[PDB]
């Protein structure tokens, strides 16, 4: 909540941008992990009685 | 959605294989004029 933010951003928010890119890659990477471990076969057969 | 509120795309009831990971069971694609669908 600092009253100057644009100067702070243009001087040091690019490191945070790169690290946020790293976290976004990790997040999409975890989603792809869940997809490849649970969706090996994409066929839905209903449970028989 | 459970992930958040989405503005700017048209929701469709039918489902396809998705390439843009949104989250909370929702995905995005650009095919339908032509507009982004969720
Ligand atoms: C999608 O489902 C909702 C469920 O209420 C319905 O109101 C809507 O008309 C449906 N749209 C299409 C294109 O089937």
UniProtKB/Swiss-Prot annotation, chain B:
Disulphide bond pairs: 18-27
Residues carrying covalently attached carbohydrate according to the record: 13, 32
Outcome (variant: residue 29 to A): No effect on O-glycosylation by host GALNT1
Quaternary data: Binds to host ACE2. RBD also interacts with the N-linked glycan on 'Asn-90' of ACE2. Cleavage of S generates a polybasic C-terminal sequence on S1 that binds to host Neuropilin-1 (NRP1) and Neuropilin-2 (NRP2) receptors. Interacts with host integrin alpha-5/beta-1 (ITGA5:ITGB1) and with ACE2 in complex with integrin alpha-5/beta-1 (ITGA5:ITGB1). May interact via cytoplasmic c-terminus with M protein. May interact (via N-terminus) with host bilirubin and biliverdin, thereby preventing antibody binding to the SARS-CoV-2 spike NTD via an allosteric mechanism.
Function: Attaches the virion to the cell membrane by interacting with host receptor, initiating the infection. The major receptor is host ACE2. When S2/S2' has been cleaved, binding to the receptor triggers direct fusion at the cell membrane. When S2/S2' has not been cleaved, binding to the receptor results in internalization of the virus by endocytosis using host TFRC and GRM2 and leading to fusion of the virion membrane with the host endosomal membrane. Alternatively, may use NRP1/NRP2 and integrin as entry receptors.
Name of protein: Spike protein S1
Native organism: Severe acute respiratory syndrome coronavirus 2 (2019-nCoV)
Lineage: Viruses, Riboviria, Orthornavirae, Pisuviricota, Pisoniviricetes
Portion of the full-length sequence here: 645 to 694 of 1273
């Amino acid at each position: 909540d600092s009253t100057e933010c644009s100067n702070l951003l243009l001087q040091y928010g690019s490191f945070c941008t790169q690290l946020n890119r790293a976290l976004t890659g990790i997040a999409v990477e975890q989603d792809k992990n869940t997809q490849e471990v649970f969706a090996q076969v994409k066929q839905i057969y209903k449970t028989p009685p | 959605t459970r992930a958040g509120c989405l503005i700017g795309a048209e929701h469709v009831n039918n489902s396809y294989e998705c390439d843009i990971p949104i989250g909370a069971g929702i995905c995005a694609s650009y095919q339908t004029s032509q507009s982004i669908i969720a």
